Amino acid sequence: MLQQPTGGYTTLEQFAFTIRNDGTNATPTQFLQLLSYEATENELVKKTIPTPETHLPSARNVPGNVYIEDAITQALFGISAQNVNAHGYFSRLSALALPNTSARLGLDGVIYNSETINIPFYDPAAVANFAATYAKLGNASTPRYRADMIDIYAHVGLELAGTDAERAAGVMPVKRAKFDSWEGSLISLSRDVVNWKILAFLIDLCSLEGEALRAFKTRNRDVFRMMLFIMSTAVAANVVNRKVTKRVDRVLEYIGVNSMRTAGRTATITYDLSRHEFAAKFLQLTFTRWNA
Amino acid sequence: NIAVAHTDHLSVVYATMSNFMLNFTNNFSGNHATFKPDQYVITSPEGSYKPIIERQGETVDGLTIIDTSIVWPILCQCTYPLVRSIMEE
Amino acid sequence: ALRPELAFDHDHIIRCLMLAAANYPRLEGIIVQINTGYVASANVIRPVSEKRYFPENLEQNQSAARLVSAVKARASEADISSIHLAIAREVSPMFNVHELKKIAESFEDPSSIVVVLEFILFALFFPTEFNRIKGDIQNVLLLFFSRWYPVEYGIFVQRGATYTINAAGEFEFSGRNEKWDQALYLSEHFPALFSDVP
Amino acid sequence: ISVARSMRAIVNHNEVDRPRGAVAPSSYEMDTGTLSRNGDLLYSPVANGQVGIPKLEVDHISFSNVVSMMTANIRTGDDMAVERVNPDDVRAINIRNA
Amino acid sequence: ITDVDSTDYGKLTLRFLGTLTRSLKMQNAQIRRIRPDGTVLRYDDQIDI
Amino acid sequence: ITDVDSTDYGKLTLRFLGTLTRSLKMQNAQIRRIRPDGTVLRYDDQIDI
Amino acid sequence: KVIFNGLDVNTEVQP
Amino acid sequence: VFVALGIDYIDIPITNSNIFDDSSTPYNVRIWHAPTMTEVNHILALMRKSTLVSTHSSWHWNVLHTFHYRSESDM
Amino acid sequence: PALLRDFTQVNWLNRDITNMLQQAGTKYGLGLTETRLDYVRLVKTIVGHALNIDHFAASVLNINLRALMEANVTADDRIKALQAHSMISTQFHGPNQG
């Protein structure tokens, strides 16, 4: 068992989140610094996010050790994932929800049915707090429990593009992101992000409380913003490049507006409808924890 | 016409077969509303996990799928020692 | 009067049986083969060439044609091995979960009550095996109820297609219509047609 | 010329410890590294807590790489059997309202 | 060596998937009741034999 | 150089079609609706697939 | 017609 | 009727007000099985992925309904 | 090349190679690095092998296996096409290959 520090698991160097950039392992914050936003005439106002459902989907009798982190990260940032709600192994997180369950969530991002040797795993209390919320990804497809997949993106914009005044206001102009760019920059970004061990982030996010939580929320704001960025590019209506005197600025229109697009494109990862419903759910839960 | 052959004979065959050495499981408790089979696994800290009862789809043995139409020949295409000159050991 | 041999080791034989049931697919059919042989040796049921599905002279009757074709589509030819296997399956342990041999019945014609009867009889002759496959037969029954009793069907399914008994034994219906799969047999869920909760 | 060269003079001199102009293979030819969860190949990290450099990000050739491969238990493109079951009556088939 | 027919041991014999081969390794393995969730329950003399 | 594989029904349909492709330009060719009036429309996000 | 405990397959689907 | 029939929606033709004209109707009203606000949001989102549809700010019988037009001009 | 280590007679080459392999930033390996059993069947499926192969081909082959693995469609999904091509309310069954 991995001990959880007074800070999160994210304080451990083992769980550093870092996109590749200019040939180096850049922190998400030093990528987001490259970003710049042109305003447009449209306005985003953030509606209250509906409380996530009480229901925890059944962890069906599964003999296998589900690879959950891979399923989640590929469902959110995966270049090729589709029909993510067909298998429905996300429900498996609710095996971890129970008090004194035999099941362990390994650092590998796998949900072992029982504790097993030479596989380090997160502290079960932490995982229980984490599962009590994120098992609800397992009902992202069921019609009764689906998240709104349009309004939620406003929050995304505010949490990404939004200046501190726009965030305090709860309302920002719809923006148009841009940054100096290398070829395939968003594909490479998203793949650097799929490799992130985000269960560390989500687990500290659900387990930590008090100042120790708030100290986490500032420290990892940029990380959450990078995840939000990859999703944003996934749902952006269009993603052009601009020549700018022997330099190129990648430009996505628009931050905070889900275009509901599903036809694939070379520039960025694409959501099938299932990935849209899933991502909407994920945002519902995660933003719910993020604002409390 | 067929019931006495069931109740007054075949039932005894069930009662004996139930005590046979190899019939080691509790198949049913008579209450459809609540009965759920006991579920065991071989399992180790080394990480082996072998369920005794698995859902594996049709198998080569042919015991897995159930044709319920078997009910018909029984009701209307079978003799029995009790039902059917009519003395029979 | 003592016999010079070792005691039958219950605690070990049961253990080895579990290890075998885990590792040996053949085990089920090994055990069945004993029970089946026994049914056969009790000489309790034998097929006859004389079928008896219809009263005279309903088969001849031209109005009965749809009904008769329904029955003929259900009624299998008798074979000792298959009959014996059913009686033996009732008592033999199950390891690989059983599944229904799916019917495709739409339940438009009245004659389709035949299929419902096919299940009722099965629930009588073979309550154990029935209980093993009853979710899969609830999927057929639901198509029956939604046609024959659409209003009651709506109320029922509105309550939930399944439930889960909790602590203290109370039922907790899902509130959500959803097709059963035998994947659920080993889970906490129950088909709700069999809840017997008014 | 010989931008393609990877090794040279695989012999040993009897006087000097390595032949003048002999070239060792680059380290990247030998870093199998890892298959990242995304499926992109990576060089091994140069330090603790660092992710590895993706292999296609840079111009060195790597000659040991992890390739995912399906096993005997998988199979793809095999034809598969089914039980078709035609409707009992053509006139019982609703077309709408769906 | 001991003349047992170990055929199909440790194997699934599915009609459409073909035969499949599970691992035979299982050191220190026990018989344990599972929750319907699939997770193992600690042994209880009150219910388990 | 790349002589494509073709099922017999594919060879049949191919000869049915079954020849020139040379005429149409493809320099940045796109699928786009014309107006009946003859003007080539821009891709409508809410109409064209 | 005749009892058959397996799935009664008839067609094939190519990939 | 949605549960009992198993369908996700029903396409009801509209009525012309003047019973005399037998002209083909401009559009028609689909009716959706969406009891919750969530089911409604999902149907609306999916509706924005398909040609020539519109809906009211609120609906009668509290049941979601969408107009589907036979042409742009009718819309 | 990493295999030549302690097998080549050529001293400087073995020294340079050992020197690269004994760096923290690089580590050769050949064989079955990874395994992925099915959740239900408990048999292995997608196994990752460290082949001696250029990173470009490994990249392409992985792109392929990834497209096929991550799509989450199965042989059973073929039924959806057969329904399109057969009369309305025709039923299809089995075999749930998964």
A191 CB within 8 Å of a chain D CB: yes
Alpha-helical runs (H) found in chain E? none
E11 CB within 8 Å of a chain B CB: no
Q: Do chains E and C touch (3 or more CB pairs under 8 A)?
A: yes
HSE (CB half, 13 Å, CA atoms) of E12? 27
CA distance C6 to chain B (A): 17
Residue A117 is which amino acid?
I
Query: Residue B57 and residue I96: Cβ atoms within 8 Å?
Result: yes
- Return the residue matching tokens 């790489």: D65
HSE (CB half, 13 Å, CA atoms) of A118? 3
Concatenating the DSSP letter of every residue in G1-15 gives: -B---S----EEE--
The residue segments making up the domain with residue A136 are 1-292
Query: Residue C106 and residue D85: Cβ atoms within 8 Å?
Result: no
End-to-end Cα separation, chain I, in angstroms = 42
Alpha-helical runs (H) found in chain H? 2-5, 37-47
Separation CA I12–CA A256 (nearest Å): 60
Contacts of C15 in chain E (CB under 8 A): 31
Backbone dihedral region for residue C102 (phi beyond 0: left; psi -120 to 50: alpha; all else: beta):
beta
Biggest alpha carbon–alpha carbon distance for chain A:
62
- Return the residue matching tokens 């029955």: C71
Kind of pairing between the strands at B65-66 and C99-100: parallel
**CA-CA distances (angstroms) from residue C151 to A107, A197, C196, H2?**
51, 51, 19, 11
The answer for residues whose C-beta is within 8 angstroms of residue B27's C-beta and 6 or more apart is: B37, C90, C91, C93, C94, C128, C132
- Contacts by A286-290, CB closer than 8 A, 24 or more apart: A286/A202, A286/A205, A286/A224, A287/A49, A287/A152, A287/A155, A287/A159, A288/A49, A288/A51, A288/A52, A288/A133, A289/A133, A289/A205, A289/A206, A290/A159, A290/A205, A290/A217, A290/A224
Kind of pairing between the strands at B65-66 and A19-21: unpaired
Alpha-helical runs (H) found in chain A? 28-32, 68-77, 84-87, 124-134, 153-160, 164-169, 185-194, 198-207, 211-219, 221-235, 273-290
Asked if A65 and A105 touch (Cβ cutoff 8 Å), the reply is: no
Neighbours of B25 (CB within 10 A): 19
Kind of pairing between the strands at E30-33 and H53-54: unpaired
Give A104's strand partners.
A112
CA distance G13 to chain C (A): 19
Query: Residue I43 and residue E22: Cβ atoms within 8 Å?
Result: yes
CA distance C77 to chain G (A): 5
As given in the structure block, the two tokens for residue A288 are 């719910």
Q: Which value in Å is the resolution of this experimental model?
A: 3.0
Determine the residue among D5, D20, D23, D27 to mutate to test chain I binding: the one whose Cβ has the most chain I Cβ atoms within 10 Å: D27
Is the N-terminal amide bond of F18 cis, ω within 30° of 0? Answer: yes
Q: Do chains C and D touch (3 or more CB pairs under 8 A)?
A: yes
Sign (positive or negative) of CA dihedral A271, A275, A276, A281: negative
Chains within contact range of chain D (3+ C-beta pairs < 8 Å):
A, C, E, G, H, I
Separation CA C51–CA B73 (nearest Å): 8
- Return the residue matching tokens 């296996």: I65
Reported as type and span, the H/E element at residue A252 is: strand A248-255
DSSP state for residue F34 in the 8-state scheme = B
- Residue whose C-alpha is closest to residue A104's, from A86, A125, A90, A134: A125
Total domains in chain A come to 1
H36 CB within 8 Å of a chain C CB: no
DSSP state for residue F41 in the 8-state scheme = P
C174 Cα distance to chain centroid: 24
CA distance B48 to chain E (A): 5
Contacts of I41 in chain E (CB under 8 A): 12, 17, 20
As given in the structure block, the two tokens for residue C126 are 């073979």
Neighbours of A35 (CB within 10 A): 18
Asked if A104 and A115 touch (Cβ cutoff 8 Å), the reply is: yes
E16 CB within 8 Å of a chain D CB: yes
Asked if D40 and D54 touch (Cβ cutoff 8 Å), the reply is: yes
Contacts of E16 in chain D (CB under 8 A): 80-81
Neighbours of B65 (CB within 10 A): 21
Considering only residues 9 to 68 of chain B, which have any Cβ-Cβ distance to chain A shorter than 8 Å?
39, 43-47, 49, 51, 54
Angle (CA) B61-B66-B68 rounded to 5° is 150
- Residue whose C-alpha is closest to residue A284's, from A51, A64, A29, A26: A51
Q: Do chains H and G touch (3 or more CB pairs under 8 A)?
A: no
Contacts of B56 in chain E (CB under 8 A): 12, 14
As given in the structure block, the two tokens for residue D62 are 């790597």
Size of interface B-I (CB pairs under 8 A): 12
Radius of gyration of the CA atoms of chain A, in A? 19
CA of G6: which chain D residue's CA is closest? D83
Size of interface B-C (CB pairs under 8 A): 201
E20 CB within 8 Å of a chain A CB: no
Query: Residue C109 and residue D88: Cβ atoms within 8 Å?
Result: yes
Query: Residue C79 and residue G4: Cβ atoms within 8 Å?
Result: no
CA distance G4 to chain I (A): 15
Asked if G3 and B67 touch (Cβ cutoff 8 Å), the reply is: yes
Separation CA A161–CA A289 (nearest Å): 20
Asked if B13 and C90 touch (Cβ cutoff 8 Å), the reply is: no
Separation CA A210–CA A12 (nearest Å): 20
